[PDB]
C-alpha cells in the first residue's frame, strides 16, 4: 500500500500526508508487529490497569492484517517510528494522528494497539537499563488512566493521548512514586528532568511530593548516569499564581507551588491560551456550556468564577532544584 491510499481509507486529513510519507520511508519494523490477543491481551491490559470494560472491548476489536490492511500498515510503521527513538529524549513526541471514529473500535483504540505492540520493546529497554520491574510496570500503568479518561471525557472507549505515551514507550519517562520524571534538555542542551503529575494516585500530599523528589537524582544517576540533571522543570496550570486568589492555604497545589521558581514572564492578561489546559485537567472539558460543569470542589468553582469574570488562566513554567 502507498500512503495516499492509507490516508484516504482511514479518513485522515490532508495535513497528515507528510507524516504518512515519513512512515512509508521508514517502513515496517525489523521485528514484525505482534499484537497479543485473547487472554494474553487480557492479562497485559490488566497489568496496565486498563478498566475491565475497555479491556474487553480492546481485545474484541483487535485488528487483523488482512481485514484491516490500511490500519495495519499504520500500526506497523507507527510502532517502528516509536522504537527507532527508544531512549531518545531529544526526538519530538510524535505518536501520529488520532483515527476518525467512523473506523469503529479498531480506530478508537488504535493507539492502545500501538502501546501493546511496543510493550516488549520498552520492557527490554528497561531491563538493559537496570530499571526495577515494579518501576517499569508502574510507569506503563498510565495507559489505564488515559483509557479511563477518554471514556469520562467523550462517553465511549478510546485513548487519544498518544503524543504523551511516546514518553513512556521510549523509556524516557518514569513514575517514581507520586510524580513522573522525564529525561529532558533545555534549549542550550543542559539536562533537566521534566516533572509531571498523573491523575491516579490520590491527592498531591506534600510528603508524597517530597518523597518523589528525593528519588529523582538517585534513580537517574544510577540508570542514566550520562544525563546528570540537577533541576526539575515544569510547565503547568498548577503553577499559575492566580490560583492563590481562590485556593486556601490547606491546598496541596498552593503549598507545593511555593517552592517553585517561575522562569517565564508574567503573561498578558488577555492571553487566553492557558484556559484550555486548566479546563482539560480540572473538567476533562469537551466544549460544553460552563454552567453545566460540576462545582463540587473549590477549584472547580474557582476555574469557572475566574472565566466568568472575563479573566484567563495561564500555564506557567518554572523549576525546582533536586535534592
Ligand atoms: C507542583 C508543580 C508541578 C508542575 C509540573 C506538572 C506538569 C503537569 O503534569 S501538568 C498536568 C498536571 N496533572 C493534572 O492536572 C492531573 C489531574 N489533576 C489532579 O489529579 C489533581 O489536580 C492533583 C492530584 C494534581 C491535585 O489534587 P489535590 O492534591 O487534591 O489538589 P489541592 O490543591 O489540594 O486541591 C484543592 C481543591 O481543589 C480540588 N481539586 C484539585 N484538583 C482537582 C481537579 N483536577 N478537578 C477537580 N477538583 C480538584 C480538591 O479536591 C480541593 O477541593 P476542596 O478545596 O473543595 O476540598
C-alpha 234 – ligand 1 centre gap (Å):
15
- 25 with 164, same domain? yes
Q: What determination technique applies here?
A: X-ray
- 58 with 25, same domain? yes
256 close to ligand 1 (CB < 6 Angstrom): yes
- 49 with 124, same domain? yes
C-alpha 275 – ligand 1 centre gap (Å):
15
C-alpha 203 – ligand 1 centre gap (Å):
7
CB 51 within 8 A of CB 144: yes
Residue nearest to atom 24 of ligand 1 (CA): 203
234 close to ligand 1 (CB < 6 Angstrom): yes
Determine the Cα–Cα distance for residues 147 and 312; give it in Å rounded to an integer.
Answer: 29
Q: Which domain holds residue 201?
A: 173-323
Last residue of a domain, one of 151, 172, 193: 172
Q: Which of 146, 197, 294 to mutate to test the pocket of ligand 1 (most atoms within 8 A of CB)?
A: 197
Last residue of a domain, one of 138, 154, 172: 172
Element (H, E) at 176: strand 173-176
236 close to ligand 1 (CB < 6 Angstrom): yes
Q: For residue 308, give the nearest of 281, 275, 262 by alpha carbon.
A: 275
- 290 with 149, same domain? no
Number of domains in the chain: 2
In 3-state terms, what secondary structure has residue 226? Answer: coil
Instruction: Give the CA dihedral 21, 27, 32, 33, nearest 10 degrees.
Output: -10
- 22 with 142, same domain? yes
Determine the Cα–Cα distance for residues 149 and 43; give it in Å rounded to an integer.
Answer: 21
C-alpha 254 – ligand 1 centre gap (Å):
10
CB 209 within 8 A of CB 256: yes
- 199 with 214, same domain? yes
Locate cell 490477543: which residue? 37
Q: Which DSSP state fits 30?
A: S
Last residue of a domain, one of 120, 147, 172: 172
Q: What contacts 152, CB < 8 A, 6 or more positions away?
A: 284
C-alpha 199 – ligand 1 centre gap (Å):
8
Determine the Cα–Cα distance for residues 173 and 194; give it in Å rounded to an integer.
Answer: 9
- 75 with 116, same domain? yes
Ligand 1: which atom is nearest the Cα of residue 196?
9
- 209 with 313, same domain? yes
Q: Which residues of 226-263 are buried (b: 16+ CB within 10 A; e: fewer)?
A: eeebebbbbbbbbbbebbeeebeeebebbebbeebeee
Determine the Cα–Cα distance for residues 186 and 132; give it in Å rounded to an integer.
Answer: 28
Residue 220 belongs to a domain with what CATH number?
A: 3.40.630.120
Residue nearest to atom 55 of ligand 1 (CA): 298
Cα-based angle 202, 204, 209 (whole degrees, multiple of 5): 125
- 163 with 255, same domain? no
Q: Residues forming the annotated binding site for CoA?
A: 197, 204, 237, 251-253, 281, 298, 300
- 293 with 318, same domain? yes
CB 250 within 8 A of CB 156: no
Q: Report CA-CA distances (Å) from 300 to 115, 136, 140, 276, 286.
A: 32, 33, 29, 14, 15
- 321 with 190, same domain? yes
- 159 with 258, same domain? no
Q: For residue 167, give the nearest of 144, 192, 140 by alpha carbon.
A: 140
Amino acid at each position: 500500500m502507498d500512503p495516499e491510499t492509507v490516508r484516504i481509507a482511514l479518513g485522515l486529513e490532508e495535513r497528515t500526508a507528510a507524516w504518512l510519507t515519513e512512515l512509508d520511508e521508514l517502513g515496517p519494523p525489523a521485528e514484525p508487529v505482534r499484537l497479543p490477543r485473547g487472554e494474553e491481551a487480557r492479562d497485559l491490559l490488566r497489568r496496565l490497569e486498563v478498566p475491565e470494560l475497555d479491556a474487553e472491548e480492546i481485545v474484541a476489536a483487535a485488528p487483523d492484517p488482512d481485514r484491516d490492511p490500511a490500519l495495519w500498515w499504520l500500526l506497523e510503521r507507527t510502532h517502528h517510528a516509536i522504537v527507532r527513538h527508544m531512549g531518545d529524549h531529544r526526538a519530538k513526541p510524535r505518536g501520529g494522528p488520532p483515527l476518525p471514529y467512523e473506523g469503529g473500535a479498531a480506530a478508537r483504540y488504535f493507539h492502545v494497539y500501538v502501546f501493546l505492540a511496543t510493550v516488549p520493546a520498552v520492557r527490554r529497554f528497561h531491563a538493559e537499563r537496570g530499571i526495577p520491574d515494579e518501576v517499569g510496570w508502574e510507569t506503563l500503568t498510565q495507559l489505564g488512566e488515559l483509557v479511563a479518561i477518554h471514556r469520562r471525557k467523550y462517553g465511549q472507549g478510546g485513548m487519544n493521548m498518544q503524543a504523551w505515551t511516546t514518553y513512556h514507550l521510549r523509556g524516557i519517562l518514569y513514575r517514581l512514586g507520586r510524580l513522573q520524571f522525564s529525561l529532558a534538555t533545555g534549549k542550550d542542551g543542559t539536562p533537566h528532568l521534566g516533572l509531571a503529575v498523573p491523575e491516579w494516585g490520590g491527592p498531591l500530599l506534600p510528603k508524597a511530593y517530597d518523597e518523589s523528589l528525593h528519588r529523582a537524582r538517585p534513580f537517574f544517576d544510577r540508570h542514566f548516569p550520562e544525563h546528570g540533571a540537577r533541576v526539575a522543570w515544569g510547565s503547568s496550570w498548577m503553577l499559575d499564581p492566580q490560583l492563590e486568589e481562590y485556593l486556601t492555604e490547606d491546598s496541596n497545589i498552593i503549598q507545593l507551588a511555593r517552592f517553585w521558581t517561575l522562569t517565564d514572564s508574567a503573561p498578558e492578561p488577555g492571553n487566553a491560551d492557558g484556559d484550555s489546559s486548566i479546563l482539560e485537567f480540572v473538567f476533562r472539558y469537551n466544549g460544553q456550556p460552563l454552567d453545566e460543569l460540576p462545582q463540587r470542589s473549590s477549584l472547580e468553582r474557582a476555574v469557572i468564577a475566574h472565566l466568568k469574570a472575563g479573566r484567563h488562566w495561564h500555564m506557567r513554567t518554572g523549576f525546582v532544584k533536586l535534592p
